[PDB]
């Protein structure tokens, strides 16, 4: 939404036109930074086919990797935070009562007496299997 | 100034008729605010809380 | 704006200038979020409501008088946001 | 006149212009195709080539820039600050061009002094990428530091800027690892090579060793063994 | 100009502090003494001179007899008082006051017959172009960046407690209390004699007045501070003066600041410092009392201690009501707080028509000080 | 130590030397005394937060009120006239959502460019 | 804590003061120095610094 | 830089014709008075091949002898302060802290009780020998 509305803001400067191929390249140097990061996240998910906990660790890996590039950090951080609040909400409903529900099988914890579950290791949270054992 | 007095009189009489619980000083203040384009809805809301 | 808003809290509560602080913050917030009118400006709608109200209570004589008095408020030519004031009185009945 | 002003502009903005530039060091500056023209075209055409080379050096490093982040966390941080000072050079490119359309008259000699002020900036970044080709850290931090060891108090602010942004993954490894001892290095780009060794519970066998050759020069040796301890 | 070329002579109560304006400490401060030879002969020490004054009278004080021209803050003799002004301008500064205006000081309780006297000296004898007679009370208040408040002048003179309301003082609240710092240094020798160390040299007694500010410290609650001495606390410091006599502190450390509140160690029935503070404010107008509690200023050379700021704060509430905000403004320097106010006044914009010149002196004589 | 602080104040705003410092000290004192010779902070703060609200800086208004409330509910730990610190700060005061921020910044970038072009023309 | 809270308020009210100047101002307030007199002194010092800086 | 923007100033006039050789020479006479002293500065740095305090020594005696033109005195005063505020800053941390950085032998007092510190006379100062000893 913020990407397509900026192009209309510079199209108000197109009715008084004086934009160049070179003046426009300057507005495009922030949104190639945002969109190239957006493209390199998009290519990895295709190659994986990842969903559920396999997306969560993939976006958690980009929060480490894009440290030291501060503004590139802000979108990769934002994207894991918006992927984690659905995920950890399905976790919290299991802490308040005891609901394990898997509609799409987004959560890793499958449901079976002996109190078997088995997690899976295919899909795991943002952190490692130790958070799974807990 | 003359006109303004007469206007405050009408306003006070209307107030009495509608038995609102506003007197002259509170009403003058209410009028000065409204005239500045204040949202009467929001204003009524404040006034009821202030009377409680 | 600010001074008038404050004076109102002060007057209705009958308490002094720095004794109205807590209400002063409540009004500034309520006013700040909905500062300007959200509804069309149209004096006629309010006068009809004020007159239905009188009809509703069968206080028809006070209603008839109220029309004379409203006409008098208009004819003097002093106010401009007449609607708002009348809506504020009506809300307070 | 004005055509030669456009012609150097495309060479600054990128490469080529109204004839073929494509050559880097096969370069007779630019081909005219004619020579019946003024001889003052030979000394304006040498000024046309000499900003474009130092724009393209920063650009080819930016071409090799894009990775998931592999081989060095430090490497793309340095190329990130070369993209930030790349960004400043384009604003100085748009103000030249604004002269052409109506808002006036052009002269190559005034836009020359408006490119002579980017020229101490972009020349020393072209030396700064020349120090290290490497992506590995504790030597990029030693590169930006050797330039504040050089004089000239007006490029000393420009490398000190790069130095504060290069250092920003390094020192973000340090203070967290002092309080918790958390780690992320898998190239050993920190100045301590954090556990490579085979995992055995401790008895005074070396598992953590600094492995001297990844030490910045914005830290000194007695402070590297203090923080290792 | 006069922005840096107005001379600040703060004639204090025992030291004259001269200097040029736009500094934060006086150039040359030293105690004001003159010395008169009885029979003139062959001299000894410094070269042939008619009188040893000041810092050539402080170098030799056993070949001369000392006389302060400023005694108990006030000029007793005016002949020798010109002699120390002569010393401050030409030896311990060196400029002629005839091109440079002079800012000279006064007591908050000197008589007017005395005040026309110091105006007659500067205009005629030193032939100053302009000058201004300024209160020491208002200057110390000005270094503390206020214009109202009461200053607790405790100097090497009379304790003043002067409430000033907007540069105008209350002429029914300036108490003259006879405690001076020179009274304490003298009290300190005679309780050193209970330890067994007695003076007999004037030079050893000069270091008593230094030690009073130097080694001696103030803690909160003296009363428990002697109680902590009975369980043997650490507070006893022994200064060594090369010779067999010792000046120690430890059982006389806390009695000597305790004498501020209790003049009974000195043997009198007079008011204490907090007491003379409280009596002065308690006859002030009820509507401007509040402004004096919140702008209490310490000033002078007696209240030179590291820890007397908070002692007066925990101590003054227990007199005055508690529905008063009392806040003790304690600067670390305060001997020079009269002088820093006197230099800053020379650099005041609203003072360039409050100067008292020789022309206004020529039209009304020495009652132009009435002002 | 009023005297250090004021010297410190004259130097701080400037982040030869003696001459300038004395001048600044004089300016400062002259102004200070002139002003002295010649409501509670919370109601003033409220008026400002009200200004922020009408101008639709609601988030900042909310945060501002909250922080003031936080200082009021705290006992002071290093400040003895907390009210005066607030008053001084106070006396020194002064969809179509997403295109507004973008429109202001783009207009500013164009402006910066115009003022730098006007400067470049001006030297000639 | 307290110094950081006061530094955010300084920014919301646009007074532009960082932690150095704020710390000098705080020690003045504490010495019972009037806010209004000081806000003037400060306005003059900014104006004067900026003037001296512009001739530079 | 400050030469070549004053150049462009006078070429702004040349965008209309008018200019002759003595129209331009009211610019050449202030620039000529700067350079002619800047070139007699410039020979002794080069063929001297000086560094350190020795450099400050040549610029100090050139600043004394060019008291004849105020415009000539002012350039070499700017030259001796733009060369000494670096060299003052290295001695300043030496007399303040007692530790020095010299990676290019930037100070006359080189490092290395009886740890001897040797002061060279190839960085021979503008300031006297007695204040160099202290």
Curated annotation (Swiss-Prot), chain D:
Gene Ontology cellular component annotations, sorted alphabetically: centrosome; cytoplasm; gamma-tubulin complex; microtubule; spindle pole
Localization annotation: Cytoplasm, Cytoskeleton, Microtubule organizing center, Centrosome
UniProt-listed GO biological process terms: cytoplasmic microtubule organization; meiotic cell cycle; microtubule nucleation; mitotic cell cycle; spindle assembly
A GO molecular function held by the record: gamma-tubulin binding
Family: Belongs to the TUBGCP family.
Subunit text: Interacts with gamma-tubulin.
Protein name per the record: Gamma-tubulin complex component 3 homolog
Location of this fragment in the whole protein: 246 to 484 of 906
Swiss-Prot record, chain E:
Coiled coil region boundaries: none
GO molecular function, one term: ATP binding
EC number: 3.6.4.-
Keyword terms, alphabetized: Acetylation, ATP-binding, Cytoplasm, Cytoskeleton, Hydrolase, Methylation, Nucleotide-binding, Nucleus, Oxidation
The UniProt record lists the keyword Ribonucleoprotein: no
Domain of life: Eukaryota
Primary localisation category: cytoplasm
Subcellular location: Cytoplasm, Cytoskeleton; Nucleus
Pfam family, one: Actin
InterPro entries cross-referenced by the UniProt entry: Actin, Actin/actin-like_CS, Actin_CS, ATPase_NBD
GO cellular component terms given for this protein: actin cytoskeleton; cytoskeleton; dense body; focal adhesion; nucleus; plasma membrane
Sequence positions bearing Methionine (R)-sulfoxide: 43, 46
Known role: Actin is a highly conserved protein that polymerizes to produce filaments that form cross-linked networks in the cytoplasm of cells. Actin exists in both monomeric (G-actin) and polymeric (F-actin) forms, both forms playing key functions, such as cell motility and contraction. In addition to their role in the cytoplasmic cytoskeleton, G- and F-actin also localize in the nucleus, and regulate gene transcription and motility and repair of damaged DNA.
UniProt similarity note: Belongs to the actin family.
Other observations noted: In vertebrates 3 main groups of actin isoforms, alpha, beta and gamma have been identified. The alpha actins are found in muscle tissues and are a major constituent of the contractile apparatus. The beta and gamma actins coexist in most cell types as components of the cytoskeleton and as mediators of internal cell motility.
Complex formation: Polymerization of globular actin (G-actin) leads to a structural filament (F-actin) in the form of a two-stranded helix. Each actin can bind to 4 others.
Name of this protein: Actin, cytoplasmic 1
From Swiss-Prot, chain G:
Single biological process term from Gene Ontology: mitotic spindle assembly
Superkingdom as given in the UniProt entry: Eukaryota
Protein source organism: Xenopus laevis (African clawed frog)
Residues of the full protein shown: 13 to 68 of 72
Homology family: Belongs to the MOZART1 family.
Location in or out of the cell: Cytoplasm, Cytoskeleton, Microtubule organizing center, Centrosome; Cytoplasm, Cytoskeleton, Spindle
Oligomeric form and interacting partners: Part of the gamma-tubulin complex.
GO cellular component, one term: interphase microtubule organizing center
Functional summary from the UniProt entry: Required for gamma-tubulin complex recruitment to the centrosome.
Protein name: Mitotic-spindle organizing protein 1
Keywords: Cytoplasm, Cytoskeleton
């Amino acid at each position: 939404k913020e990407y397509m509305i900026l192009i209309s803001q510079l199209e108000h400067l197109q009715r008084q036109g004086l934009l160049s191929l070179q003046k426009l390249w300057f507005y495009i140097q922030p949104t190639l930074r945002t969109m190239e990061v957006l493209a390199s996240i998009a290519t990895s998910l295709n190659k994986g086919e990842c969903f559920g906990g396999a997306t969560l660790s993939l976006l958690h890996d980009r929060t480490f990797g894009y440290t030291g590039d501060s503004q590139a950090q802000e979108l990769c951080l934002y994207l894991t935070k918006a992927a984690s609040a659905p995920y950890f909400d399905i976790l919290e409903r299991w802490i308040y009562r005891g609901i394990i529900n898997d509609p799409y099988s987004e959560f890793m914890v499958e449901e079976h007496w002996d109190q078997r579950y088995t997690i899976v290791q295919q899909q795991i949270p943002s952190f490692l299997q130790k958070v799974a054992d807990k | 100034m003359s006109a303004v007095r007469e206007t405050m009189d009408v306003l006070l009489e209307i107030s009495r008729l509608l038995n609102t619980g506003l007197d002259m000083e509170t009403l003058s203040i209410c009028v000065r605010l409204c005239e500045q384009g204040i949202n009467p809805e929001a204003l009524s809301s404040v006034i009821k809380e202030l009377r409680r | 704006p600010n001074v008038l808003l404050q004076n109102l809290c002060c007057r209705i509560l009958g308490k002094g200038e720095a004794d109205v602080a807590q209400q002063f913050q409540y009004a500034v917030r309520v006013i700040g979020s909905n500062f300007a009118p959200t509804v069309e400006r149209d004096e006629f709608l309010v006068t009809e409501k004020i007159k239905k109200e009188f009809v509703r209570q069968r206080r028809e004589a006070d209603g008839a008088l109220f029309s004379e008095l409203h006409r008098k408020l208009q004819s003097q030519g002093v106010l401009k946001n007449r609607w708002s004031i009348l809506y504020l009185l009506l809300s307070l009945s | 006149e004005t055509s030669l002003v456009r012609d150097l502009l495309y060479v600054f903005q990128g490469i080529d212009g109204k004839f073929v530039k494509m050559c880097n060091s096969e370069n007779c500056y630019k081909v005219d195709g004619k020579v019946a023209v003024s001889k003052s075209l030979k000394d304006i055409t040498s000024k046309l080539s000499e900003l474009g080379w130092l724009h393209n050096k920063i650009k080819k490093y930016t071409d090799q820039r894009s990775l998931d982040r592999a081989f060095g966390l430090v490497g793309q941080s340095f190329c990130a600050a070369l993209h930030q000072e790349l960004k400043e050079y384009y604003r100085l490119l748009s103000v030249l061009h604004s002269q052409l359309q109506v808002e006036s008259s052009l002269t190559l000699r005034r836009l020359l002094v408006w490119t002579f002020d980017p020229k101490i900036r972009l020349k020393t970044l072209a030396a700064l990428v020349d120090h290290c080709q490497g992506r590995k850290g504790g030597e990029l931090a030693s590169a930006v530091h050797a330039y504040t060891k050089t004089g000239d108090p007006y490029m000393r602010s420009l490398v000190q800027h790069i130095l504060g942004l290069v250092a920003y993954p390094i020192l973000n490894f340090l203070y967290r690892w002092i309080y918790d001892g958390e780690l992320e290095d898998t190239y050993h780009e920190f100045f301590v090579a954090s556990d490579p060794v085979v995992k055995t519970d401790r008895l005074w066998h070396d598992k953590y060793s600094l492995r001297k050759s990844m030490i910045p020069s914005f830290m000194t040796m007695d402070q590297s063994r203090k923080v290792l301890l | 100009e006069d922005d840096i070329a107005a001379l600040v002579v703060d004639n204090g109560s025992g030291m004259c502090k001269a200097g040029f304006a736009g500094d934060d400490a006086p150039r040359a401060v030293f105690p004001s003494i003159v010395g008169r030879p009885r029979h003139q002969g062959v001299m000894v020490g410094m070269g042939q001179k008619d009188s040893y004054v000041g810092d050539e009278a402080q170098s030799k004080r056993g070949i001369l007899t000392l006389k302060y021209p400023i005694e108990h803050g006030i000029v007793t003799n005016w002949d020798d008082m010109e002699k120390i002004w002569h010393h401050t301008f030409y030896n311990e500064l060196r400029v002629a006051p005839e091109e440079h205006p002079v800012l000279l000081t006064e007591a908050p309780l000197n008589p007017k017959a005395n005040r026309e006297k110091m105006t007659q000296i500067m205009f005629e004898t030193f032939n100053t172009p302009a000058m201004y007679v300024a209160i020491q009370a208002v200057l110390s208040l000005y270094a503390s960046g206020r214009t109202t408040g009461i200053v607790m002048d405790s100097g090497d003179g009379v304790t003043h407690t002067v409430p000033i309301y907007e540069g105008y003082a209350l002429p029914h609240a300036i108490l003259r209390l006879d405690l001076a710092g020179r009274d304490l240094t003298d009290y300190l020798m005679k309780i050193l004699t209970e330890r067994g160390y007695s003076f007999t040299t004037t030079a050893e007694r000069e270091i008593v007045r230094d030690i009073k500010e130097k080694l001696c410290y103030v803690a909160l609650d003296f009363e428990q501070e002697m109680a902590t001495a009975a369980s043997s606390s650490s507070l006893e410091k022994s200064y060594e003066l090369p010779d067999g006599q010792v000046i120690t502190i430890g059982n006389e450390r806390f009695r000597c600041p305790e004498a501020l509140f209790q003049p009974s160690f000195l043997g009198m029935e007079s008011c204490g410092i907090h007491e003379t503070t409280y009596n002065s404010i308690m006859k002030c107008d009820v509507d401007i009392r509040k402004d004096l509690y919140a702008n209490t200023v310490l000033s002078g050379g007696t209240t030179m201690y590291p820890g007397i700021a908070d002692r007066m704060q925990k101590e003054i509430t227990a007199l005055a009501p508690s529905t008063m905000k009392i806040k003790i403004i304690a600067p670390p320097e305060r001997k020079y707080s009269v002088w820093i106010g006197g230099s800053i006044l020379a650099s005041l914009s609203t003072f360039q028509q409050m100067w008292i010149s020789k022309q206004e002196y020529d039209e009304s004589g020495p009652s132009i000080v009435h002002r | 130590s009023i005297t250090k602080l004021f010297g410190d104040l004259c130097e701080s705003h400037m982040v030869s030397k003696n001459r300038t410092k004395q001048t600044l000290k004089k300016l400062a004192y002259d102004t200070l005394f002139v002003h002295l010779f010649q409501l509670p902070v919370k109601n003033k703060i409220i008026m400002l937060s009200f200004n922020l609200r009408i101008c639709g800086m609601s988030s900042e208004a909310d945060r501002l009120e909250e922080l003031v409330e936080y200082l009021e509910q705290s006992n002071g730990i290093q400040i003895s006239d907390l009210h005066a610190v607030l008053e001084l700060l106070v006396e020194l005061s002064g969809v179509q959502v997403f295109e507004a921020d973008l429109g202001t910044t783009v207009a500013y970038q164009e402006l910066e460019i115009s003022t730098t072009i006007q400067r470049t023309l001006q030297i000639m």
